[PDB]
């Protein structure tokens, strides 16, 4: 169970990294919505990670 929990936590971290790259892309593309979505996703994931 601990290993499974760790894997889930690891997956969340990986997702956050992908989101960060997307946020950088949004700045280059000048799209407000893409940047906003990534930030929101990072926050919920962080909360989820803390719970985990």
């Amino acid at each position: 169970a601990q290993k499974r929990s760790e894997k889930q936590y690891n997956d969340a971290q990986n997702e956050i990294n992908k989101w960060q790259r997307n946020a950088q892309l949004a700045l280059q593309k000048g799209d407000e919505n893409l940047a906003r979505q990534a930030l929101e996703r990072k926050k919920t994931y962080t909360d989820t990670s803390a719970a985990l």
Binding site: A23, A26, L27, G30, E32, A35, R36, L39, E40
Partner: peptide
């Protein structure tokens, strides 16, 4: 968040 985005927008 919007305020933070504005700073990001310049870049």
């Amino acid at each position: 968040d919007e305020l933070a985005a504005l700073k990001a927008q310049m870049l």
